[PDB]
Symmetry: C2
Subunit: 200 residues, 2 copies
């Protein structure tokens, strides 16, 4: 079985992660209830693993801010805490889909990544296509590639806010790309507003 | 087009990376020659990007070793250089398959990852199954999952030696797993030797 890594954690926190993980698994509609429990625990354990990494990051950052360090000494110490955090994300990133692949196919693994990132890939992709119906095939492919990338970082983020901000950076990249390719995004939005009304 | 990031690099080094990248692409048998050139440059550029990251890591490590620092001061400085390196790998890891996905399907992206890691996934998987014909399905799935994980790290390694050592760590993990599940690996190897001879 996959055990839930709940030892020495606040029960209210454990419960919140278990229920969050269960809701993601429910959407998969798995027919084997034991497999569904194992999947649920792999997901819950990743949430806890990420929490522990950010707790260390925050403790380091607080100690630096409260220390004497002042200039580049300070800022380099802060950057070093962030690098330590990213190195922990890197070292544990690929183990998560490896564990899920014991139980799930590639499509289900993607549904789990979407569940953890609030389905922002699909929502953003469809909204972009709705607002710019003239997009070339190659543009749709590039836009979709950057949203998939964004999701790899967002699934590792600390909380809902940081997840949305991670997608925000790639959405900015999408906009710069479209403008560089001659699209007038202000105008595209005006015409979409009009399409929305006429569509009624 | 994808441009090759060759500016200000030694031409002999550039040529070595271009030829290495070309050999990987040749194995794909792509029918569109312009697409094959773009793919070749995305691969070459990843080699250069990795090289630059390790050059910074090595320069930092050398300066620490040559400095006054001695105890935990020294060792923490060394660990901080390694964390900076891992953070650069993390930040650029997901951009590589995003770029390849502009040109390639998922099967071809996997062939590129295999090309960069000397096909060690398939070789190791098949050898393991050849040496232990009694493996359970669930064991084959676990073994394969760890080799896929290993490949994500190996493709980011500095050179051939470090690639083989990365797979070596996961092969050690495979062995510990099989022994924990009651397999006697010394005996399995003896019987395989005998199977190899009788197989003639």
């Amino acid at each position: 079985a996959v055990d839930l890594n709940k030892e020495n954690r606040d029960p209210k926190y454990v419960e919140s992660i278990v229920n969050r993980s269960q809701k993601i698994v429910d959407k998969l509609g798995l027919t084997d209830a034991k497999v569904a429990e194992d999947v649920c625990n792999v997901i819950a354990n990743r949430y806890f693993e990420l929490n522990d990494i950010y707790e260390i990051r925050d403790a380091k950052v607080k100690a630096v801010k409260e220390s004497g360090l002042t200039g580049d000494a300070k800022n380099e110490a802060l950057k070093a805490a962030e690098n330590e955090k990213d190195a922990a994300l890197y070292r544990s990133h690929f183990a998560f889909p490896a564990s899920l692949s014991l139980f799930l196919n590639e499509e289900q693994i993607e549904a789990v990544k979407d569940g953890m990132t609030y389905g922002v890939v699909k929502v953003t992709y469809e909204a972009t296509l709705d607002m710019i119906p003239s997009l070339k095939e190659e543009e749709k492919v590039q836009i979709y590639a950057w949203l998939v990338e964004a999701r790899e970082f967002a699934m590792d983020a600390e909380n809902s806010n940081k997840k949305h901000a991670a997608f925000g950076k790639y959405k900015g990249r999408i906009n710069n790309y479209l403008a560089k390719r001659g699209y007038n995004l202000t105008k595209e939005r005006e015409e979409w507003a009009k399409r929305v009304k006429a569509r009624g």
